Each structure stands twice: as C-alpha cells, then as structure tokens.
Amino acid sequence: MTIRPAYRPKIVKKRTKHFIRHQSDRYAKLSHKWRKPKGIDNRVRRRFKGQYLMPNIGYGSNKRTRHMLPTGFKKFLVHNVRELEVLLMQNRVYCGEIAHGVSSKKRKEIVERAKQLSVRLTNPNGRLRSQE
Amino acid sequence: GHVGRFVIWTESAFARLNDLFGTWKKPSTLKKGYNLPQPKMANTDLSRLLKSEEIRKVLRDPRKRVFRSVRRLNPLTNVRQLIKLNPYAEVLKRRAALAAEKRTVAKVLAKAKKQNVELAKSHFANVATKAAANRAKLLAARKKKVA
Amino acid sequence: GIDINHKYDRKVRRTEPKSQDVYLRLLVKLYRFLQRRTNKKFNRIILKRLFMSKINRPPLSLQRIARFFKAANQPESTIVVVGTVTDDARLLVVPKLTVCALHVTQTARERILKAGGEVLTFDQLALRSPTGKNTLLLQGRRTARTACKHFGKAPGVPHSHTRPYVRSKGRKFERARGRRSSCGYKK
Amino acid sequence: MSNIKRKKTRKLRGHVSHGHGRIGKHRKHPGGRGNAGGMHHHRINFDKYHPGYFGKVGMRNFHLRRQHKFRPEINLDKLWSLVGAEKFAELEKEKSTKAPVIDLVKFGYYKLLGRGHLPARPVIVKAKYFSKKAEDKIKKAGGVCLLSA
RNA sequence: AGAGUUAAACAGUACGUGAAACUGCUUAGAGGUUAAGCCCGAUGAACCUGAAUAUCCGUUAUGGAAAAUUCAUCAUUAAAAUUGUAAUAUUUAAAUAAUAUUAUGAGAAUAGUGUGCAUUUUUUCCAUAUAAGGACAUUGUAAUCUAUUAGCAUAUACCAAA
RNA sequence: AAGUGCUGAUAGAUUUAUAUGAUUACAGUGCGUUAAUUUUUCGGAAUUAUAUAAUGGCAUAAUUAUCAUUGAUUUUUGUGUUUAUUAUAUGCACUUGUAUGAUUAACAAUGCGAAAGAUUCAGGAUACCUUCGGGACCCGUCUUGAAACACGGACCAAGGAGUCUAACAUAUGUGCAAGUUAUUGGGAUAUAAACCUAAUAGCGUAAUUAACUUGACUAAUAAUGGGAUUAGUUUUUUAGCUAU
RNA sequence: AGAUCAAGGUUAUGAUAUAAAUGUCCCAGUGGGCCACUUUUGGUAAGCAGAACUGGCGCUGUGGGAUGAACCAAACGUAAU
RNA sequence: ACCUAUACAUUACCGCUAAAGUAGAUGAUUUAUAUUACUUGUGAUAUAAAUUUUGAAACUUUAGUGAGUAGGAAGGUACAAUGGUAUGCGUAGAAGUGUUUGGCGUAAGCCUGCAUGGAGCUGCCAUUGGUACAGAUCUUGGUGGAUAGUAGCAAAUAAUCGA
C-alpha cells in the first residue's frame, strides 16, 4: 500500500534468537534476561562448550541497518498531531508509533491526517474496532 | 539552570545597569571594584570570520577527490593485470605464443604428411604466408642494400 | 592470533578537554580549521595548548614577559601566550607591546593600556597572522607551583631534597628523629 | 551529595566483590587503628616519608605569645606599588624634588628586608627595623632610612 | 441456584487494584531413555512476518482534451524587501566596523490590468511507436572477480647415463 | 623453468561515491595517404624503408677486475657489422561498448501492492509442544584444587549491605590574581532565599637555626645566574620550485 | 682538565621498531601457590618436601591420548568456504 | 590417498585502536547553448537545465586488529524525588498486572496490540538519594513435595442390645 521507504535492502542479522541468562531453568525466581555470571567457577563465564551463546560486540547488525524494523524505517515515538508535523518532509524515511496513552479521540486525528501526510504507522486500528 | 526568560525593563531601571556594571572603559559604581568581566573570545563570529580575505590566501589543500580505489587483483587469473603493473610481460607471451603457434602448424603437417588432405583453407593460407614473408626478405635483398 | 596487541597501542594524550564551554569550544571549532589547511607547526602548538587544565596551563607574570620582549631585535613580533598574563608591580617602566592571550586580569589591562599597547585575543589575533610571521610564543613555568615539590622521596641519598607533608611549622614537627644529628641519625 | 554515576561504586554492583578483594578482603581494620606503631611495625612507611618524628627537638617555650615574633616582612623590590604607580613616572624626568616619604607602619609592613634591587631614586623610608644588605644599597642610591617612631 | 441493586458483584466484610510459588479444570499434543532440564541446526503442526511501481537500443518521438494566465517575444502599475552603492547619527583623537533612519542603483519579486491575451502558449489527463507497460522479490542459467580444489598436459632446459 | 593449454567446480561479491565533492583515464571501435607480393577470392591477406638511447648477435679497440691465466669471468666502454627485437611517430567526434573508484552482473521464469477482501515467495524454537543428530556434571565460594563423598540453597513476592561528615593529598573542572576571602556579622527588603557591606582575621609574601640575633643574584638589571639538549619566530645568504 | 679556533665523506655490525620519552596518584589488588624436562639437595621414599633457569597452570576456553586445570597441536571478535 | 579444530587465508560484518581527509555555498559544480577574448584552440561572459546541509562532540576514508577472572578507568540503561523544559498525553481510560499480538540493542532495557483496571502519569537537559538482589545456618508473610492423608491418636479391665 504505502510506498516502502528509501533504499530498502535485505535486513540480514547476526544471531537472532534471544539470550537467556545462565541457570534460568530451575529457578523461577530467575527471570529471563542476562547477567554475565561473574563468579569464579562457572560453566558459561569461561565461554565454555555448550551454553547460552555468550554476548559481546560481535553479534550486532550492520551500521546502516541499525534499528531497522522489518519495513525499512527506524521506529519513532509520536504523541500528538504537532509531532506529526515533525514527520512532514522526512515521511519517506521514518515511521510512527502512536503512544499508548493517546485515546481514541486523538487517535482519530492522527489516522485521518497523517494518512494524507503519507507516513506509515505501525499501529492504526488500536481501539478501531469502530466503537467508542 | 537555563538562560533566557522573556524580560521587560523600565527606563529608570534600564539606566541603572550602567551604574551597576560600569562600561568597558571604567569600573562600576554601586559595588566596590566589581569590574565588568571579560570575554575569552572577542569576536565570536564564524561565518564572517571565514569571509575572509585574510585567511584564505594562505590555505593550501582542497583534496576534493578521495583517492580510495582499494581493491587488490590477481597476477594470473587477470592476464589483463600483467602488462599494467609490468610491461615486458607482453613480450614474453608474444614471443613464446607464436613459437607455440608455429608448432601447432608443425604437428598438423605430420597429419598433412600422413594423409595430405588439407591444407585447403584452414592451414593452406597458414603455410602460404612464407611466400608473402619471402617478400619480407626480398626487401632484405633489395631495400636493405642502402648501407 | 599473533602475540602482539601488546601495550601501549594507546596514544594517551588529550583529544579534547573535559570542559563544556561555548567560548573555549569556539576557539577549538575555529582553530581546527586553521591547522588542517596549513601544516604549520606553530598552529598545532596553539592547538595542543588549548587543552590542559587550570593548573599546567601555566600562570605567567609580567616581568617574565618584559625581558623576553627585551630578547631584542624583535620590535614587531606579537606575543602569544596560552594562559594568564596578569600584572606584577615591580616592573616599573612598561614597554609598548601587543599580546595575544587567553585571560588578562583587570589590573593587567590597566597598565598595558597605560603603556599603552592594545592587547588582543585569539580570534582578534586570527584575523592578522595565521602564518605566525613575527610572532612570539611564551609558556610559563611548571615547577612553579609550590604544591609540586613532593617528589620523589627516598631520603638516604643527598639527592633527597623534597618537602615532606608538614602539619605546621615550629618545633616538635618532623624534625627530631631522622633529620638532625642527635636523635638517631641525620638523613 | 555526589553525581553518583561518576562515583566509583554505582557501577561496581554487580561485580561480586564490589572493590576490595577476594582473598584477604575488606576486614574492618587490618592496620592498627591509626598510627600504630610508628616505632613498632609500621617502621618503613614512617622513615621514609616522615623523618624527624617521635622525639624532642628542644626548647620548651612555655606559653609563646604570637605577638613578640609578629614582624610582618615587606621587601624592597615592591616599594613602588607602595607609592603610586604613575607617581614613579614623574620621578624619572629628572626632577630631584625627591626622596619621597614612605611610611611602613601606616601600611601594615614592619621590617624592610633586602631582596630588592631598587631603582636609582633616593628614598626617605621609615621602617621598624633594618637589613644590612638593603640599607647599604639604599645608601648608594641617594636615599637613606630612618627608624619609625 | 433464579430475581435483582448498581457505571461496575470480572467491587458482596481477604468487600479497589488480585500477581509470584502451588496448581483444581478443559482443549491441544506426546511418550520404556540424557533421571528432569537445556544448548546446535533443522523439524511438521499452528498462528504470524515482510512483500512492489513511469523502460531496451529514452526521466524518447508523436497525436487527444480540459481548464487558464505574475509565464510569451507579453506590457504597465502596486508593493514591500534583499543585495550592492552614497549620506547622516551612536566612535575609545580620526578611519573602519556596526545599528538606526535617507536616497540612488540593478535585477529579481509578488498583488492587479492588458497582442493572441489559450494563434503555433501554460498547467492537469488521453494516444500510438523501438526492448516495450513490467520496472519488484525468490529462483535456473550465462559469463566476471579474489580466494580454491581436482583433472590433462605444448615445447624446453640440466647433469650423467651411452 | 615458460599461459604449455585448458577443461570441469565449489561457496562468497562491499559500495544512500555528496542522501557535505573526477563517474574520469587507460585501452578497444567506425570515419580522412600508399604500393604490390600473397592467399580467399565474400572479406581478409601480406610490404618495407618512417625515427631512435637502440637492447641483444658478431667483430675489433679499450680498460676495471678476477678462482685462474691456453684462459675465462667480466668492468668501463668505444666502434663497426649484419641480425633479431620492442616501444615512441593514432588526432576527430562516436559507441549497450574493456579495465576504475573493497571490478556480480544483460537474460529468462515465477506474481496483478487486486474497492474492502486477499492468494504468492522466502524467512520466523518469538517462549512451548512434536521428530533426529552431536554437546552436556548443578548453582554461589574460600583454595594449588570443587561436578564435589566440602560447607549455604524448599519454593516466591516486598525489605537488605559501599553511606555520613571530618579535615588533608592528588588529579581535575569553574572565577580570579600578589592577591584572595562575606558566609561571625548588620543594613537595605518580599523570606529560612538573595542583596549589599566594615574593620579584622585566615592563608599565601620570606627562610630559618634548639634560640637571641640575622634575613635571601657584585647593579638604575637578570629567569635551575653559565653550559649543551631544543620546537617556534626572527635573520645571513645559497640554490630551488610555483606564481613570476 | 677546561673554554675556542683550524682540517674532515657518504658515520662506522647485523635485524627491527607492533612507536619511542618521562613526572605525579604511591593508584585498586597481591604478598599460601602448583608442574613437567634437564640441573638438584633432604630422605630408602612417595601424587611428599627444598630449590636455581626457563616455559605453562591459577586467569584459559581449547581441537587430540575415551577419560583428565598443566600432556601435544593452538593461545578463543560474529559469520560461509 | 585421505581425516578432522574457535588455529592459518580470502571475501563481507561488528565494536575497538591507529592514521588521514572535509567547512570562502550573497558558493561550488557539471550538463548544454548563445556568444565572444578568439590562441590554431584554450578561456572568460550570458541563457537554459540539474546536483549540491552535520550534536565539525559531525561526516568520509584507510589499514590493522579482538580470550580473561582479582582489580582500575570508558561511554550505555532501570528504579527515584528536586528546579528548568516539550501550545506533553489523561474517565473518548492515566500507574502497575498478565500475554500462543508485532518489533527494535551487541546487551541492560523500551516501544507496541489486546484483556483487566479507576485517577493520575512519563520523554529530552541541568542536578542528585535510604537507587536495580538468586545468594547472607539472611529477617517477615503465604506455600510445596513426604501427606494433604501417610506418621500415628495402643497405659488406667469393657461396654451392651431396646425406647
């Protein structure tokens, strides 16, 4: 529908599956997210052979497909119609995500104006659902 | 901790700062010895500083081209490369290539000895060139007799 | 892989100061323009002197200027000091001169305007002589500060000579056992 | 009172020792609480770095008053910020209307020392003391001192 | 249990928000294995994600309409400005720099009228012609390039060995 | 040792080079002398002299130098000579055209971003479950050593351990400068703010010896007083380059 | 021995410089170690102790003798060949 | 002849270290054309067209390079209140709570959809406090398996039909 942005390549990432925090299997007081286990015995700290691939600066993406969402842009926070005037002339580059304290009164005012401003949103149809 | 509120003065007020911070030529009045402080950079333009007719008679280098061209190349798979980094590489080929090329004639003539078929238009003109090359040596008998 | 990424591969010295000014950056954002068109060594030493702290960008008192302006056969050279050429009294007569300087105190302008030679700043200088032809460069002392003689003690040598941390002067203050004769030993 | 991202221990959690060791770690005092024993086992880091200690240089000055050794010390090299600064300019015309009068007790300076190396002008100067290396050089310079009341 | 009362009872004396560990339930799978776990790359199942734009041998030739017009080869006039001069006034003795008003200068610049003012203009849609309406994604080629293996070799040249 | 001459493949192809700077120069193409030899005869084909430092072949002169020296290796060359050789003697426009800016790209197939609706191609453990191949001790920590037949851990939500001041040192920011400081104070005047401010008084200025004394370069001047290590500027003249 | 003139080649062994050169904080730690080859005391001796000269283990994964902190290959950015 | 390493080599890529380039845009720059000075042919003029922006803390470009506890500095994010700030969203659903909706980072962490819910909340930049927890034979409050039905309720003579 919308023209895809501004020299859209193959977004091809190094390691994709998430990174899950040594011994978070047998403690559900242990969360999901990582903490380099800094203590002198460990079985992953020594970057061993078998465990949950240990992060560093290697795995990142290219320094032009930084932040690049699967539709070419780089995502960007939007609040009201005045910040969509920030996306006046850059409309072929970035996109918008309607901030989730905006009600369905004001989100009527983005989706009918910035459509004609030719920007892309990730989420229209939030509370649309054609009721109040 | 930020500059600039929108400030509105009055005339009796506005003629007290000259008392309250004197001038560039004097100390002030209402405080003892509080001089008007200094700048550390006394012209603070940059665009009209680069105008300039006193700076850009001494500048040297607008290296506008970048000169990057950073690609390596192979010295055998690119036969194109050879002559460029090294002339006389054409010499050693175009010496030995014809020596092989006459030797390609030198073994089909054994087949033209065994069967004697052609020699019609594929190698007949390839061996009749010596009759033309005889004339390249009749000038050695008629045009090289000048010294 | 190999083995050397050894040490130091790390060029320590300062790229830009830990200072968030908008005047001092304006010299940097000017004098980066005037050392990367010319290659003149005189501009780079201006640039590498725009970077030290409050101490070690040395204070520099006016009598040190004068006999350097009496380093004679130079009646036209402009004075460049990256520092603070303040005023000292006991230079009674003051000569005509024109200085480029960072910071000039209010009692220092008042005698050189009484000289009367105009002092100029750096952008004020920058209009005139970017080449540095007939330009002088004066940098003050750095054993100057009295807090910088605490180095480097191992007292047995008579090359000791190095100011211990006193409490305060008088008697019964770091003066019995070790220093003088009779209380154990002379240093 | 700190900007604490700078302060060393708000990135140290979590390392799992926080900054003071993992063998013989931070035990409430190892040292001897204070200065013990400057003669006893902290010997080496008290000579060197602090000789002259422990003992008795001797004169038991019973109840010093810090007035009898007041003597605030001015030097002859200044001497003309003492007078007006432009007032020196009219003394180099030449006009021998001077030696001028330089009180010191009214200034707040007492004994004229002799670092000095004054100009050639005569000066009549009044101090609360003398210094021999100065006063002979003043006496070549056409001026002389007289002791203040 | 119904019937209610209230915006709410998915607020009914732990009477707001109700998690976390336990798990009672139904659907979904599965199974004598490293004891459970994971980690590596696939894996059906299942929902999902990202998908598009004015040419080969052109941002070409050519024909249809519509609206109009400071644009023509358009004239004037109304401006305000900008740039660049000239002058005056604030200057640290003068110049300069700098603002403030004063005028000239050129060209542009809009609002308004005007050969033809829609005559061969201008601005929006419609047309054929050369590879041609796609111009994009995943694919099979074909060759090119730096690395890189496997498989044949055209003629040499060297001692001795005869 | 020489492209000797390919024939078959593998996976991989940076580059928004203005989204703040040759798309240029090497080469290849079709247009404007020539003469015949030769071949095909449809093109092609083949010819020298035009100029070189020539660079080897050979010859001699000549020397530097040499294990050796009948000599041979040579060196500097010098000349003659034929014989080989190569590059220089291609402007003028044009061309999808060679090569050059980490030198990958023509073709073909597969498909309509189809009012809403919605098929197609790749990907996608998001966090399961299903199916197999290798991996694999289960977490703190003292210690040379913990998978420990070493101690602490049943599970979870909330709470918890680098702080306060004290004076110092150093690094560093910010003003100022032989000065600096109100922050004990009053008064101006709206409130715990700030403003303004006077004498002091801290600390430096000028040192000490146990103290009394004395008091910091011969001079109207000197700077670790002289020395060498020196950037930089000035200058002597030199050639020199670009502008000239 | 010092200052100051006079003459002076191309600076005088190889191979490099991943850059050399220094003053503070005396800056956090750490002041218990282990092993193999040779060299080696103590003891009959030991996976014991006691060392000098290296390399390594603690700090270190790793491919290989199934296994094993040191053995022998090699010292660990993410990826295809 | 083959065999396998995170080693060696080459292409991409990430961060880090080193080196190097870029600011007269009231310009620069080609593309054409009118002209011209004409110097054969190189230049200036005029017209027409189009390319030309960044926290110079930027940007381009180049090479090399990457283990790590004890420990030191480097920028990065949570949870706070205080003054500045965004004509900041908020009963037309604000804070946390779940999640088989979707996504960005190397990573901590956000952004987003739906479902509760009922009255307040965050982003840039200055500051800053009792600031992020798996641990302390840690404190307190729920709650497991064993068992949520096992352990065992066995001393003192012994209870019984019918209403």
Side-chain angles (χ1 to χ4, degrees):
Chain A
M1 258 186 278
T2 306
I3 303 185
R4 53 102 186 164
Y7 274 164
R8 177 177 69 178
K10 58 186 83 164
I11 293 180
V12 185
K13 309 186 145 153
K14 330 191 152 55
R15 198 207 200 254
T16 166
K17 171 85 205 178
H18 217 253
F19 271 54
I20 331 177
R21 201 210 157 144
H22 175 35
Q23 203 184 31
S24 315
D25 319 335
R26 49 190 78 72
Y27 289 82
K29 62 157 153 277
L30 263 158
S31 62
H32 177 96
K33 318 209 178 312
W34 167 268
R35 310 281 175 277
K36 180 160 148 211
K38 289 184 175 71
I40 65 178
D41 278 349
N42 257 302
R43 222 183 74 210
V44 197
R45 178 211 90 127
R46 340 181 192 170
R47 51 207 317 284
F48 217 68
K49 197 198 175 175
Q51 273 68 214
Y52 312 26
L53 303 208
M54 213 166 165
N56 53 88
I57 35 157
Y59 303 114
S61 164
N62 187 4
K63 216 166 170 40
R64 292 182 297 260
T65 80
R66 187 64 100 163
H67 297 314
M68 278 196 49
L69 258 68
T71 171
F73 316 107
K74 303 146 197 183
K75 214 174 85 161
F76 156 74
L77 214 57
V78 67
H79 264 173
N80 80 315
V81 62
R82 300 297 285 162
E83 268 159 37
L84 265 160
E85 211 166 357
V86 182
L87 257 58
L88 191 140
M89 50 83 70
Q90 298 181 23
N91 76 149
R92 39 189 198 254
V93 192
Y94 292 90
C95 54
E97 279 216 344
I98 288 155
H100 62 316
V102 177
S103 74
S104 197
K105 168 166 192 167
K106 302 290 299 170
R107 212 175 313 160
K108 178 199 64 184
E109 210 160 10
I110 278 183
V111 76
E112 293 159 332
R113 159 148 182 167
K115 162 193 208 169
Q116 304 157 4
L117 295 168
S118 53
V119 307
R120 191 81 170 272
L121 294 153
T122 293
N123 48 355
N125 319 320
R127 313 139 158 75
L128 301 167
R129 181 82 189 278
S130 62
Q131 320 294 334
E132 99 275 10
Chain B
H2 286 312
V3 313
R5 271 179 63 236
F6 163 63
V7 169
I8 296 165
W9 308 87
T10 76
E11 155 64 30
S12 290
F14 197 70
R16 289 276 274 265
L17 285 88
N18 44 8
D19 309 267
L20 279 151
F21 307 96
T23 171
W24 202 47
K25 95 208 287 183
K26 267 188 303 299
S28 188
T29 74
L30 293 206
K31 276 85 79 171
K32 75 160 164 60
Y34 190 87
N35 205 279
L36 191 60
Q38 325 303 116
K40 297 184 180 183
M41 180 144 188
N43 215 57
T44 197
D45 194 296
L46 198 65
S47 177
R48 210 184 254 108
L49 193 41
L50 290 196
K51 202 167 48 167
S52 91
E53 308 319 289
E54 266 295 320
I55 286 305
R56 298 188 47 144
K57 53 183 177 168
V58 204
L59 86 170
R60 185 144 167 82
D61 211 3
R63 281 310 263 274
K64 199 164 73 62
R65 198 179 66 85
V66 300
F67 186 41
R68 37 151 178 187
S69 291
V70 79
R71 175 58 244 164
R72 211 202 188 270
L73 270 190
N74 189 282
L76 192 135
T77 308
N78 198 237
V79 185
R80 180 70 256 164
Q81 187 45 255
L82 314 174
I83 182 69
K84 204 255 179 162
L85 40 76
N86 186 41
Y88 196 82
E90 195 178 0
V91 173
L92 297 170
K93 294 307 163 76
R94 274 164 57 182
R95 172 173 296 272
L98 50 88
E101 182 45 59
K102 59 96 176 176
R103 276 200 274 104
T104 57
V105 195
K107 83 174 295 183
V108 65
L109 53 87
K111 277 92 193 185
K113 173 259 302 175
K114 288 145 206 170
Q115 275 71 250
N116 314 261
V117 292
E118 63 94 12
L119 67 158
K121 220 195 288 192
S122 89
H123 307 313
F124 167 63
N126 308 356
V127 307
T129 174
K130 195 52 203 63
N134 285 122
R135 315 270 192 267
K137 288 307 176 188
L138 305 180
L139 58 96
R142 81 183 188 275
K143 293 201 58 183
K144 278 198 162 190
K145 314 304 182 52
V146 305
Chain C
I2 42 185
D3 266 317
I4 32 180
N5 183 286
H6 201 200
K7 85 197 150 188
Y8 275 165
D9 213 357
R10 199 259 210 195
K11 187 176 181 66
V12 289
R13 307 147 79 262
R14 197 174 254 167
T15 318
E16 45 187 357
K18 195 207 164 279
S19 316
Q20 295 171 353
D21 207 301
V22 313
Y23 277 174
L24 199 85
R25 293 291 159 185
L26 211 79
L27 270 189
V28 165
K29 220 185 293 186
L30 177 74
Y31 269 50
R32 275 200 148 91
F33 201 99
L34 282 205
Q35 65 99 9
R36 78 143 188 83
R37 295 313 289 275
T38 175
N39 299 321
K40 178 59 82 171
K41 183 78 176 160
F42 169 68
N43 271 27
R44 263 293 296 267
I45 316 157
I46 289 177
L47 202 81
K48 218 181 285 198
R49 280 181 70 80
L50 292 195
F51 283 139
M52 308 182 185
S53 74
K54 198 196 81 195
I55 301 185
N56 307 66
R57 258 186 279 138
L60 188 45
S61 191
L62 201 35
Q63 286 173 356
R64 182 49 149 176
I65 298 291
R67 275 83 177 244
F68 276 162
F69 192 76
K70 209 40 79 179
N73 311 112
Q74 297 290 96
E76 300 307 304
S77 280
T78 313
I79 302 105
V80 166
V81 39
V82 190
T84 54
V85 276
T86 71
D87 156 64
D88 179 16
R90 325 155 286 207
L91 191 85
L92 322 164
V93 182
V94 287
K96 195 256 286 183
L97 84 171
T98 285
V99 192
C100 174
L102 284 182
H103 168 77
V104 169
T105 49
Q106 193 42 249
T107 171
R109 272 173 215 237
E110 271 163 36
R111 274 186 79 182
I112 59 188
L113 285 146
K114 196 179 175 284
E118 272 275 328
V119 72
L120 263 71
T121 43
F122 277 82
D123 47 348
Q124 268 163 345
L125 165 73
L127 297 154
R128 197 159 307 179
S129 173
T131 71
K133 292 193 76 51
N134 272 312
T135 312
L136 281 181
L137 182 64
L138 297 186
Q139 326 186 5
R141 300 179 83 176
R142 284 188 221 147
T143 68
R145 44 163 187 166
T146 79
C148 193
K149 285 182 288 296
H150 309 325
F151 323 112
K153 192 155 213 290
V157 299
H159 214 279
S160 312
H161 282 211
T162 177
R163 203 161 299 212
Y165 277 142
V166 184
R167 192 165 108 201
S168 204
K169 292 162 288 199
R171 84 172 265 258
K172 288 194 296 303
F173 290 103
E174 296 90 21
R175 226 185 287 131
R177 191 186 152 273
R179 287 279 160 85
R180 311 185 28 209
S181 51
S182 171
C183 184
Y185 65 94
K186 180 214 304 298
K187 172 191 288 180
Chain D
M1 185 155 176
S2 293
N3 178 46
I4 323 175
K5 183 257 186 175
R6 268 154 214 172
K7 197 201 275 299
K8 173 186 152 176
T9 78
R10 294 293 193 197
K11 291 149 194 151
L12 285 180
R13 50 193 77 190
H15 282 266
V16 199
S17 62
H18 201 86
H20 292 250
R22 202 197 268 270
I23 294 147
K25 64 180 89 171
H26 196 129
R27 298 263 179 263
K28 306 289 182 79
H29 283 298
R33 199 181 264 252
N35 312 316
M39 194 50 105
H40 213 257
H41 95 292
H42 264 272
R43 182 171 304 277
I44 273 89
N45 203 133
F46 268 160
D47 47 347
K48 56 191 187 141
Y49 310 159
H50 278 300
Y53 199 44
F54 306 108
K56 182 161 101 177
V57 305
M59 207 49 191
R60 305 189 312 127
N61 214 327
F62 271 76
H63 195 191
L64 168 66
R65 303 143 174 79
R66 200 160 203 97
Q67 288 101 316
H68 278 232
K69 316 173 84 88
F70 194 22
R71 273 189 277 194
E73 294 171 349
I74 208 174
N75 267 7
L76 205 60
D77 201 21
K78 276 191 154 52
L79 201 61
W80 302 93
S81 175
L82 270 65
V83 314
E86 45 266 31
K87 208 151 282 190
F88 184 73
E90 297 91 39
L91 263 70
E92 316 311 304
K93 299 204 171 307
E94 205 268 347
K95 309 175 305 197
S96 282
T97 173
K98 288 314 152 273
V101 162
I102 299 185
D103 190 290
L104 273 297
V105 183
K106 294 166 191 41
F107 272 154
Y109 293 99
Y110 279 54
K111 162 198 289 192
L112 197 67
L113 270 193
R115 173 202 256 175
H117 271 299
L118 68 160
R121 297 314 302 155
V123 281
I124 284 300
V125 73
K126 273 194 292 183
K128 287 200 54 170
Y129 280 124
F130 78 93
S131 55
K132 185 53 168 55
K133 193 192 184 289
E135 298 300 323
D136 314 340
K137 292 300 299 299
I138 305 161
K139 276 204 298 180
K140 191 203 165 310
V144 285
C145 165
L146 300 94
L147 161 64
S148 304

